[PDB]
Design a protein around this ligand. Structure first.
Ligand SMILES: Cc1cc2nc3c(=O)[nH]c(=O)nc-3n(C[C@H](O)[C@H](O)[C@H](O)COP(=O)(O)OP(=O)(O)OC[C@H]3O[C@@H](n4cnc5c(N)ncnc54)[C@H](O)[C@@H]3O)c2cc1C
Ligand SMILES: Nc1ncnc2c1ncn2[C@@H]1O[C@H](COP(=O)(O)OP(=O)(O)O)[C@@H](O)[C@H]1O
Length: 260
Protein backbone atom coordinates (compact mmCIF):
# COMPACT_ATOMS: atom_id res chain seq x y z
CA UNK A 1 0.00 0.00 0.00
CA UNK A 2 1.09 3.54 -0.88
CA UNK A 3 1.31 6.77 1.19
CA UNK A 4 1.59 10.27 -0.32
CA UNK A 5 4.79 12.04 0.72
CA UNK A 6 5.96 15.51 -0.31
CA UNK A 7 9.58 16.76 -0.54
CA UNK A 8 9.21 19.67 1.91
CA UNK A 9 12.97 20.40 1.96
CA UNK A 10 16.39 19.15 0.65
CA UNK A 11 20.09 19.68 1.47
CA UNK A 12 23.32 19.36 -0.49
CA UNK A 13 25.83 18.04 2.04
CA UNK A 14 28.42 17.88 -0.68
CA UNK A 15 29.12 17.58 -4.41
CA UNK A 16 26.88 14.48 -4.63
CA UNK A 17 25.04 13.53 -1.41
CA UNK A 18 21.69 15.01 -0.49
CA UNK A 19 19.55 14.96 2.61
CA UNK A 20 15.95 14.83 1.44
CA UNK A 21 13.29 15.84 3.97
CA UNK A 22 9.88 14.38 3.23
CA UNK A 23 6.64 15.04 5.05
CA UNK A 24 3.93 12.50 5.81
CA UNK A 25 0.32 12.80 4.62
CA UNK A 26 -0.47 13.37 8.33
CA UNK A 27 1.48 15.56 10.84
CA UNK A 28 0.44 13.47 13.79
CA UNK A 29 2.25 10.35 12.52
CA UNK A 30 5.64 8.80 12.12
CA UNK A 31 6.94 6.73 9.22
CA UNK A 32 6.57 3.87 11.72
CA UNK A 33 9.04 1.68 9.83
CA UNK A 34 9.92 -1.53 11.77
CA UNK A 35 13.61 -1.76 12.67
CA UNK A 36 15.15 -4.28 10.26
CA UNK A 37 12.76 -3.47 7.41
CA UNK A 38 12.59 -0.91 4.59
CA UNK A 39 10.45 1.28 2.30
CA UNK A 40 10.11 1.42 -1.49
CA UNK A 41 10.20 4.89 -3.05
CA UNK A 42 8.15 4.36 -6.21
CA UNK A 43 8.13 6.55 -9.25
CA UNK A 44 7.40 6.14 -12.91
CA UNK A 45 10.30 7.34 -15.03
CA UNK A 46 10.48 7.24 -18.86
CA UNK A 47 7.58 4.86 -18.94
CA UNK A 48 8.53 2.31 -16.32
CA UNK A 49 7.54 2.58 -12.68
CA UNK A 50 10.65 1.36 -10.81
CA UNK A 51 10.94 0.34 -7.20
CA UNK A 52 14.03 1.20 -5.15
CA UNK A 53 14.57 0.32 -1.47
CA UNK A 54 15.79 3.07 0.89
CA UNK A 55 16.09 2.99 4.69
CA UNK A 56 15.38 6.36 6.32
CA UNK A 57 17.91 7.71 8.78
CA UNK A 58 15.49 9.58 11.01
CA UNK A 59 14.96 8.81 14.70
CA UNK A 60 12.03 6.35 14.57
CA UNK A 61 9.86 8.84 16.50
CA UNK A 62 10.20 11.96 14.34
CA UNK A 63 6.69 13.27 14.01
CA UNK A 64 5.53 14.54 10.66
CA UNK A 65 8.54 13.79 8.45
CA UNK A 66 11.32 11.36 7.50
CA UNK A 67 14.81 11.97 6.08
CA UNK A 68 16.47 10.07 3.23
CA UNK A 69 20.25 10.18 2.94
CA UNK A 70 20.89 9.72 -0.79
CA UNK A 71 24.20 9.49 -2.76
CA UNK A 72 23.45 10.68 -6.28
CA UNK A 73 24.59 8.53 -9.19
CA UNK A 74 25.41 11.12 -11.93
CA UNK A 75 25.83 10.28 -15.66
CA UNK A 76 29.14 11.40 -17.20
CA UNK A 77 30.91 10.18 -14.01
CA UNK A 78 31.87 6.54 -14.49
CA UNK A 79 33.41 4.58 -17.47
CA UNK A 80 31.37 1.39 -16.81
CA UNK A 81 28.13 3.21 -15.94
CA UNK A 82 28.16 6.24 -18.26
CA UNK A 83 24.48 7.02 -17.67
CA UNK A 84 24.22 7.46 -13.86
CA UNK A 85 21.66 5.82 -11.58
CA UNK A 86 17.99 5.62 -12.58
CA UNK A 87 16.17 6.82 -9.45
CA UNK A 88 18.82 9.14 -8.06
CA UNK A 89 19.14 11.82 -10.73
CA UNK A 90 15.37 11.88 -10.89
CA UNK A 91 15.35 12.60 -7.17
CA UNK A 92 18.04 15.19 -7.46
CA UNK A 93 15.73 16.51 -10.21
CA UNK A 94 12.71 17.11 -7.93
CA UNK A 95 12.10 20.77 -6.80
CA UNK A 96 11.11 21.13 -3.14
CA UNK A 97 7.34 20.85 -3.04
CA UNK A 98 6.92 17.78 -5.22
CA UNK A 99 5.04 14.71 -4.04
CA UNK A 100 6.55 11.23 -3.90
CA UNK A 101 4.79 8.06 -2.88
CA UNK A 102 6.49 5.36 -0.86
CA UNK A 103 5.25 1.96 0.29
CA UNK A 104 6.59 -0.18 3.11
CA UNK A 105 7.32 -2.27 5.05
CA UNK A 106 9.41 -4.66 3.00
CA UNK A 107 12.34 -6.82 3.97
CA UNK A 108 12.93 -9.86 6.18
CA UNK A 109 15.16 -8.96 9.09
CA UNK A 110 13.61 -7.28 12.13
CA UNK A 111 15.37 -6.50 15.37
CA UNK A 112 12.42 -7.58 17.54
CA UNK A 113 13.99 -6.25 20.78
CA UNK A 114 17.27 -7.53 22.13
CA UNK A 115 19.47 -9.85 20.04
CA UNK A 116 16.15 -11.44 19.01
CA UNK A 117 16.06 -11.64 15.20
CA UNK A 118 13.57 -13.30 12.82
CA UNK A 119 15.11 -14.09 9.44
CA UNK A 120 13.12 -15.47 6.56
CA UNK A 121 10.68 -16.42 9.34
CA UNK A 122 12.81 -17.87 12.18
CA UNK A 123 12.97 -16.02 15.52
CA UNK A 124 16.63 -15.81 16.64
CA UNK A 125 19.06 -14.15 19.05
CA UNK A 126 22.76 -13.18 19.25
CA UNK A 127 25.10 -11.09 21.41
CA UNK A 128 27.95 -10.57 19.01
CA UNK A 129 26.75 -8.77 15.89
CA UNK A 130 29.10 -8.59 12.90
CA UNK A 131 28.34 -5.73 10.48
CA UNK A 132 29.90 -5.14 7.06
CA UNK A 133 28.77 -2.55 4.50
CA UNK A 134 30.18 -0.20 1.90
CA UNK A 135 28.96 3.11 0.56
CA UNK A 136 25.15 3.28 1.05
CA UNK A 137 24.53 -0.10 2.56
CA UNK A 138 25.21 1.55 5.91
CA UNK A 139 21.71 2.93 6.44
CA UNK A 140 20.33 -0.62 6.90
CA UNK A 141 22.96 -0.92 9.65
CA UNK A 142 22.56 2.59 11.15
CA UNK A 143 18.90 2.01 11.91
CA UNK A 144 20.01 -0.97 14.06
CA UNK A 145 23.13 0.80 15.34
CA UNK A 146 20.81 3.60 16.42
CA UNK A 147 18.21 1.29 18.02
CA UNK A 148 20.52 -0.53 20.49
CA UNK A 149 21.87 2.79 21.75
CA UNK A 150 18.31 3.89 22.25
CA UNK A 151 17.97 0.73 24.41
CA UNK A 152 20.77 1.81 26.71
CA UNK A 153 21.68 0.11 28.66
CA UNK A 154 19.73 -3.15 28.85
CA UNK A 155 20.49 -4.00 25.22
CA UNK A 156 23.87 -5.71 25.64
CA UNK A 157 24.23 -6.63 21.97
CA UNK A 158 27.88 -6.07 20.98
CA UNK A 159 28.07 -4.65 17.47
CA UNK A 160 31.28 -4.86 15.39
CA UNK A 161 31.26 -2.69 12.25
CA UNK A 162 33.60 -2.56 9.22
CA UNK A 163 32.59 0.31 6.95
CA UNK A 164 34.16 0.28 3.47
CA UNK A 165 34.30 3.25 1.04
CA UNK A 166 36.39 4.71 -1.81
CA UNK A 167 37.76 7.76 -0.12
CA UNK A 168 37.77 9.56 3.22
CA UNK A 169 35.30 12.29 2.10
CA UNK A 170 32.96 9.46 1.09
CA UNK A 171 32.46 8.01 4.58
CA UNK A 172 28.73 8.63 4.98
CA UNK A 173 27.30 8.75 8.48
CA UNK A 174 30.59 9.63 10.18
CA UNK A 175 30.16 12.31 12.83
CA UNK A 176 27.14 10.40 14.15
CA UNK A 177 29.13 7.12 14.16
CA UNK A 178 32.28 8.72 15.69
CA UNK A 179 30.00 10.32 18.30
CA UNK A 180 28.32 7.10 19.38
CA UNK A 181 31.62 5.22 19.05
CA UNK A 182 32.75 7.27 22.01
CA UNK A 183 29.56 7.20 24.00
CA UNK A 184 29.11 3.40 23.89
CA UNK A 185 32.49 1.70 23.31
CA UNK A 186 31.30 -1.12 25.49
CA UNK A 187 29.12 -2.09 22.54
CA UNK A 188 30.03 -0.53 19.19
CA UNK A 189 33.36 -1.09 17.47
CA UNK A 190 33.89 1.16 14.42
CA UNK A 191 36.63 0.59 11.75
CA UNK A 192 36.98 2.46 8.45
CA UNK A 193 38.49 0.84 5.37
CA UNK A 194 39.11 3.14 2.41
CA UNK A 195 40.20 2.65 -1.21
CA UNK A 196 42.28 5.80 -1.45
CA UNK A 197 43.37 8.57 0.92
CA UNK A 198 42.77 12.07 -0.41
CA UNK A 199 45.14 13.87 2.02
CA UNK A 200 47.42 11.87 4.47
CA UNK A 201 49.03 15.26 5.23
CA UNK A 202 46.37 14.81 7.95
CA UNK A 203 47.01 11.18 9.04
CA UNK A 204 44.59 8.31 8.28
CA UNK A 205 45.12 5.43 10.75
CA UNK A 206 42.30 3.08 9.82
CA UNK A 207 42.84 0.51 7.02
CA UNK A 208 43.42 1.36 3.34
CA UNK A 209 42.21 -0.87 0.56
CA UNK A 210 39.63 -3.62 0.30
CA UNK A 211 37.93 -5.71 2.95
CA UNK A 212 39.80 -8.97 3.45
CA UNK A 213 40.44 -11.85 5.84
CA UNK A 214 43.05 -9.95 7.84
CA UNK A 215 40.62 -7.04 8.18
CA UNK A 216 37.88 -9.45 9.10
CA UNK A 217 40.07 -11.36 11.53
CA UNK A 218 41.30 -8.30 13.34
CA UNK A 219 37.81 -6.72 13.33
CA UNK A 220 34.89 -9.18 13.35
CA UNK A 221 33.72 -11.54 16.20
CA UNK A 222 34.89 -15.12 15.87
CA UNK A 223 32.18 -16.91 13.91
CA UNK A 224 30.66 -18.68 16.85
CA UNK A 225 27.41 -19.59 18.49
CA UNK A 226 25.19 -16.61 19.29
CA UNK A 227 27.18 -14.51 16.78
CA UNK A 228 25.28 -13.36 13.70
CA UNK A 229 26.69 -11.62 10.67
CA UNK A 230 24.71 -9.02 8.69
CA UNK A 231 26.03 -7.34 5.57
CA UNK A 232 24.92 -4.81 2.97
CA UNK A 233 27.32 -3.77 0.23
CA UNK A 234 27.61 -4.02 -3.60
CA UNK A 235 27.03 -7.56 -4.93
CA UNK A 236 30.76 -8.13 -5.66
CA UNK A 237 31.80 -7.03 -2.17
CA UNK A 238 29.48 -9.71 -0.78
CA UNK A 239 30.10 -12.43 -3.40
CA UNK A 240 33.87 -12.83 -2.94
CA UNK A 241 34.93 -10.21 -0.39
CA UNK A 242 32.63 -11.03 2.49
CA UNK A 243 31.01 -14.42 1.82
CA UNK A 244 34.06 -16.85 1.83
CA UNK A 245 35.93 -15.23 4.70
CA UNK A 246 33.05 -15.44 7.13
CA UNK A 247 33.33 -19.19 6.42
CA UNK A 248 37.02 -18.98 7.16
CA UNK A 249 36.02 -17.65 10.63
CA UNK A 250 33.79 -20.68 11.19
CA UNK A 251 30.37 -18.93 11.04
CA UNK A 252 27.45 -21.21 10.18
CA UNK A 253 27.49 -19.83 6.71
CA UNK A 254 23.93 -21.22 6.32
CA UNK A 255 21.88 -19.61 9.06
CA UNK A 256 24.16 -16.98 10.57
CA UNK A 257 24.52 -15.11 7.32
CA UNK A 258 21.78 -12.61 6.57
CA UNK A 259 21.96 -9.94 3.83
CA UNK A 260 19.69 -6.90 3.21
C1 LIG B 1 18.25 -2.15 2.36
C2 LIG B 1 18.69 -1.05 1.37
C3 LIG B 1 18.88 0.24 1.79
C4 LIG B 1 19.27 1.18 0.95
N1 LIG B 1 19.36 2.41 1.41
C5 LIG B 1 19.91 3.37 0.66
C6 LIG B 1 20.05 4.66 1.25
O1 LIG B 1 19.74 5.00 2.37
N2 LIG B 1 20.63 5.63 0.47
C7 LIG B 1 21.12 5.49 -0.75
O2 LIG B 1 21.63 6.45 -1.27
N3 LIG B 1 20.97 4.18 -1.19
C8 LIG B 1 20.33 3.10 -0.61
N4 LIG B 1 20.02 1.88 -1.12
C9 LIG B 1 20.21 1.70 -2.45
C10 LIG B 1 19.12 1.47 -3.62
O3 LIG B 1 18.50 0.13 -3.73
C11 LIG B 1 19.62 1.82 -5.15
O4 LIG B 1 19.96 0.70 -6.07
C12 LIG B 1 20.42 3.11 -5.32
O5 LIG B 1 19.91 4.10 -4.45
C13 LIG B 1 20.25 3.86 -6.56
O6 LIG B 1 20.28 3.08 -7.71
P1 LIG B 1 19.51 3.95 -8.85
O7 LIG B 1 18.16 3.65 -8.44
O8 LIG B 1 19.94 5.39 -8.89
O9 LIG B 1 19.70 3.17 -10.27
P2 LIG B 1 20.75 2.15 -10.90
O10 LIG B 1 21.56 2.79 -11.99
O11 LIG B 1 20.00 0.88 -11.12
O12 LIG B 1 21.89 1.81 -9.81
C14 LIG B 1 22.54 0.50 -9.66
C15 LIG B 1 23.66 0.08 -10.63
O13 LIG B 1 24.28 1.07 -11.53
C16 LIG B 1 25.54 1.48 -10.95
N5 LIG B 1 25.87 2.90 -11.12
C17 LIG B 1 25.29 3.76 -11.98
N6 LIG B 1 25.95 4.92 -12.00
C18 LIG B 1 26.94 4.73 -11.18
C19 LIG B 1 27.88 5.65 -10.93
N7 LIG B 1 27.96 6.79 -11.59
N8 LIG B 1 28.78 5.32 -10.00
C20 LIG B 1 28.79 4.11 -9.42
N9 LIG B 1 27.86 3.20 -9.73
C21 LIG B 1 26.91 3.52 -10.61
C22 LIG B 1 25.43 1.00 -9.54
O14 LIG B 1 26.65 1.03 -8.82
C23 LIG B 1 24.88 -0.38 -9.91
O15 LIG B 1 25.62 -1.18 -10.90
C24 LIG B 1 19.53 0.88 -0.36
C25 LIG B 1 19.34 -0.41 -0.77
C26 LIG B 1 18.91 -1.38 0.06
C27 LIG B 1 18.62 -2.77 -0.46
N1 LIG C 1 35.19 -6.52 -5.90
C1 LIG C 1 34.97 -5.99 -4.69
N2 LIG C 1 35.59 -6.55 -3.62
C2 LIG C 1 35.45 -6.06 -2.37
N3 LIG C 1 34.69 -5.01 -2.06
C3 LIG C 1 34.07 -4.35 -3.05
C4 LIG C 1 34.18 -4.85 -4.35
N4 LIG C 1 33.53 -4.03 -5.19
C5 LIG C 1 33.11 -2.99 -4.42
N5 LIG C 1 33.45 -3.17 -3.13
C6 LIG C 1 33.43 -2.17 -2.03
O1 LIG C 1 32.21 -1.51 -1.65
C7 LIG C 1 32.27 -0.10 -2.01
C8 LIG C 1 31.33 0.30 -3.16
O2 LIG C 1 30.06 0.82 -2.83
P1 LIG C 1 28.85 1.27 -3.88
O3 LIG C 1 27.47 1.33 -3.22
O4 LIG C 1 29.20 0.65 -5.17
O5 LIG C 1 29.17 2.82 -4.34
P2 LIG C 1 30.61 3.40 -4.69
O6 LIG C 1 31.03 2.56 -5.86
O7 LIG C 1 30.33 4.89 -5.00
O8 LIG C 1 31.44 3.14 -3.44
C9 LIG C 1 33.67 0.17 -2.53
O9 LIG C 1 34.19 1.34 -1.89
C10 LIG C 1 34.45 -1.11 -2.27
O10 LIG C 1 35.14 -0.92 -1.04
Amino acid sequence: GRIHCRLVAKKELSRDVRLFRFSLPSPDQVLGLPIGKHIFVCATIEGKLCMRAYTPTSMVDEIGHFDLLVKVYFKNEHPKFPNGGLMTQYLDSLPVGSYIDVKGPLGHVEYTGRGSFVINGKQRNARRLAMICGGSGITPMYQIIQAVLRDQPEDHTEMHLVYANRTEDDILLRDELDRWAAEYPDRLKVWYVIDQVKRPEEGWKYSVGFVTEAVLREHVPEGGDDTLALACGPPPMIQFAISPNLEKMKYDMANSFVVF
